[PDB]
């Protein structure tokens, strides 16, 4: 059981947003197949469903410019939204309703969608090196500065996901250039800095970019 | 037309205490002996997660600390006892009256002991300096409560209009927040000066802390 999501993370105004939900596990000829979206802070809006039988239900506010379709052989369903504006910028979730709960009980991870005429841009990643100005006790903090990317989002992991304890990945800030910037940090034992390897993995899907940056101690 | 109203918008509850969130519908969401109202929990970077289905039923894999009650128009989610892992936003949803809607959300914050931030500072890298821009970064680690103040000083001169900051959501384990602030200068400016400092005011600190470094020095 897995609802995988696919689609563009960037759409130009007045154009059409097309998203895809691929289901593995059980057939879409059973249950109700929904689209929901989450606005930049942080309201949820139900968009609508296509049923097991192929019947559709739409939120009346969206009835004008929405279309939900399906393909039973590929076991997928799709969302089409026309005449898109900056008010359609959101995260787009697909979710299933079964008759076991009559509620939306299984979800997809979501697709962050920005509506803009600006083109995408991969991040530059610079180290935030541990040093005597970032240690306290046996604890040293280090990080990565993920600078100048567009659009959202970026995800950061440490040592491919092995290192999760003490990791803080901050919300991005929109700079005046219109490019995003984000930091991610982690605290580790300061005695380990000389013998342990720390690498941040920065994923920027919109620009098809993945960057691994090894962060090393600052010694004068 | 139909509206779901959540109360309160934000709630602060101590560890091991009881939390209660309310959802009120303008019209009944009942039907066939069931109330079509459900409770979800959402944390940043994640989809909503079903907690309570049909007003009072516990979804599988959800702890018994969560309970749902109410009917018709008046519903209530209860967490007892609340744990660190319960810091999130909570939503109600109804799916029996056109149009389907969610409540506006209720953020749950865990109350805990006051903790002063650990303050750390990072010079820009040389690599970035090649680009003609310098980002100096001040980190405030694991503090409670959220309200914190960060001012930048360059050679002891207070800065303004050239820095930005963001704060993480509450930690799921130690119930603290962390803050990151970035001072952006041109390469020339950054090289014109020596002392780069971040001054932090927080309830856990007796006096403001000034965490600094000197360009060219250890």
């Amino acid at each position: 059981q897995l609802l995988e999501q696919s689609g563009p993370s960037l759409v130009k105004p007045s154009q059409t947003l097309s998203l895809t939900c691929s289901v593995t596990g059980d057939s879409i000829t059973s249950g109700y197949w929904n689209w929901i979206r989450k606005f930049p802070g942080n309201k949820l809006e139900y968009m609508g469903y296509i049923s097991y039988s192929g019947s559709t239900y739409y939120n009346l506010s969206l009835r004008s410019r929405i279309s939900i379709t399906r393909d039973t052989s590929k076991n997928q369903y799709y969302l089409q939204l026309n005449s898109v504006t900056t008010e359609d910028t959101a995260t787009y979730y697909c979710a299933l309703i079964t008759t076991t709960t009559y509620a939306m009980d299984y979800w997809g991870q979501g697709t962050t969608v920005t509506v803009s005429s600006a083109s995408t841009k991969g991040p530059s990643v610079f180290p935030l090196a541990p040093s005597s100005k970032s240690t306290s006790g046996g604890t040293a903090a280090l990080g990565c500065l993920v600078k100048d990317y567009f659009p959202e989002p970026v995800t950061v992991s440490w040592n491919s996901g092995a290192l999760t304890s003490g990791v803080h990945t901050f919300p991005a800030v929109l700079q005046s250039s219109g490019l995003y910037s984000l930091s991610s940090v982690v605290t580790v034992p300061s005695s380990s800095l000389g013998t342990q390897t720390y690498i941040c993995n920065v994923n920027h899907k919109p620009s098809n970019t993945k960057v691994d940056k090894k962060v090393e101690p600052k010694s004068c | 037309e139909l509206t779901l109203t959540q109360s309160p918008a934000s709630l602060a509850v101590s560890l091991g205490q009881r939390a209660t969130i309310s959802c009120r519908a303008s019209e009944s969401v009942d039907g066939y002996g069931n109330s079509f109202l459900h409770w979800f929990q959402q944390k940043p970077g994640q989809p909503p997660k079903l907690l309570i289905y049909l007003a009072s039923n516990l979804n599988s894999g959800v702890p018994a600390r969560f309970s749902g009650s109410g009917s018709r128009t008046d519903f209530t989610l209860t967490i007892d006892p609340v744990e660190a892992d319960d810091a999130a936003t909570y939503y109600c949803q109804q799916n029996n009256v056109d149009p389907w809607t969610f409540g506006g959300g209720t953020k749950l914050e865990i109350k805990r002991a006051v903790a002063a931030p650990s303050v750390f500072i990072f010079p820009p890298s040389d690599e970035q300096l090649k680009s003609g821009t310098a980002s100096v970064v001040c980190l405030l680690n694991n503090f409670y409560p959220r309200e914190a103040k960060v001012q930048w000083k360059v050679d002891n001169a207070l800065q303004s209009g050239n820095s930005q900051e963001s704060v993480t959501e509450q930690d799921s384990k130690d119930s603290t927040y962390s803050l990151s602030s970035t001072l952006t200068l041109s390469k020339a400016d950054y090289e014109k000066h020596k002392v780069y400092a971040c001054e932090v005011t927080h309830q856990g600190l007796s006096s403001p802390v000034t965490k600094s470094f000197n360009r060219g020095e250890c």
Partner: peptide, 12 residues
């Protein structure tokens, strides 16, 4: 075993 039509659930 309820089924849904135009937003509303009902038997049969």
């Amino acid at each position: 075993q309820l089924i849904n039509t135009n937003g509303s659930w009902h038997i049969n």
